[PDB]
Each structure stands twice: as structure tokens, then as C-alpha cells.
Amino acid sequence: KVFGRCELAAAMKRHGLDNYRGYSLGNWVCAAKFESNFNTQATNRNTDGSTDYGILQINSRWWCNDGRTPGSRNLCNIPCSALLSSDITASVNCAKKIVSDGNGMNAWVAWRNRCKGTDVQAWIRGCRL
Ligand code: NA
């Protein structure tokens, strides 16, 4: 599924991401925009052989099981394929554990490089929330 900007903002809010660990909804929408372009089916191979899955490009190195990432963990206790669902529940639940792990949204390098410190409220402007 490719979400609209306001459609994803609404889904993230419904799933309790809005101000989760102090990150306003604009931060989550901005991160999703640059990680996946709002496409739940996005996958990208990392040089280390891990893979990133879904709207928030969650990495098989630590967070999900894809069966092809040697020496990796599955800290969200999920098949990485669950991160590709049109339903964002598994991505949201797993993103709550990632952003809780000590470095907040810096875990998303595209968030650090493209969202952090910017006018992230612009990402939910005009949305009926
Ligand atoms: Na893994």
C-alpha cells in the first residue's frame, strides 16, 4: 500500500505514534516519507547483507526475522514480511521499541539527515487528525 501523507498521519496517530517518546507526528511522517515514500512494500538491501522492510525501513540486523541475515536478532519477535502489510500495526509496534532503545529517532539515519531540526509540522499541515 502507498499511503497518502494525511492518511498515514491518521494511521500513525490511531496506533499511538503521535508524541511517542516525545516525537511529534510530523517527525514520524517525515521519516516514513524519506525511508519508504509511504510505500508499505519498500525493501532495501544493506551492504552488510541485512535488509530494511516497510514504511519505516526496519532492519533485519536487529528487529525482525527474514532467515537470511547471519548473526542477526529479532527483537520485535516478527517475520520481516509483517512489516510489508497494508496494516501498519507491526511496523508501528516495532518502531516504538526501536525509538525506545536509547538514540530516539537517530536510529533512522534518513530522519537524522533529512527530518531532524526541520519544520516537521509541515508534514501534517492541512490533515484532519
Ligand atoms: Na534478524
Swiss-Prot record:
One of the protein's GO biological processes: defense response to Gram-negative bacterium
GO terms for MF: beta-N-acetylglucosaminidase activity; identical protein binding; lysozyme activity
One GO cellular component term: cytoplasm
Primary localization class, coarse: secreted
Disulfide bridge positions per record: 6-127, 30-115, 64-80, 76-94
Positions annotated to bind substrate: 101
Keywords annotated in UniProt: Allergen, Antimicrobial, Bacteriolytic enzyme, Disulfide bond, Glycosidase, Hydrolase, Secreted, Signal
Catalytic activity entry: Hydrolysis of (1->4)-beta-linkages between N-acetylmuramic acid and N-acetyl-D-glucosamine residues in a peptidoglycan and between N-acetyl-D-glucosamine residues in chitodextrins
Active site: 35, 52
Places the protein is found: Secreted
Matches recorded under PROSITE patterns: GLYCOSYL_HYDROL_F22_1, GLYCOSYL_HYDROL_F22_2
Domain C-type lysozyme intervals: 1-129
EC number(s) from the headed UniProt entry: 3.2.1.17
Keyword Magnesium: no
Any Pfam family matching the protein: Lys
InterPro entries, alphabetized: Glyco_hydro_22 (IPR001916), Glyco_hydro_22_CS (IPR019799), Glyco_hydro_22_lys (IPR000974), Lysozyme-like_dom_sf (IPR023346)
Expression across tissues: In the egg white and polymorphonuclear leukocytes.
Family of this protein: Belongs to the glycosyl hydrolase 22 family.
Cited function: Lysozymes have primarily a bacteriolytic function; those in tissues and body fluids are associated with the monocyte-macrophage system and enhance the activity of immunoagents. Has bacteriolytic activity against M.luteus.
Additional facts recorded: Lysozyme C is capable of both hydrolysis and transglycosylation; it also shows a slight esterase activity. It acts rapidly on both peptide-substituted and unsubstituted peptidoglycan, and slowly on chitin oligosaccharides.
PANTHER family: LYSOZYME C (PTHR11407:SF28)
UniProt-recorded name of the protein: Lysozyme C
Organism, scientific name: Gallus gallus (Chicken)
The gene coding this protein: LYZ
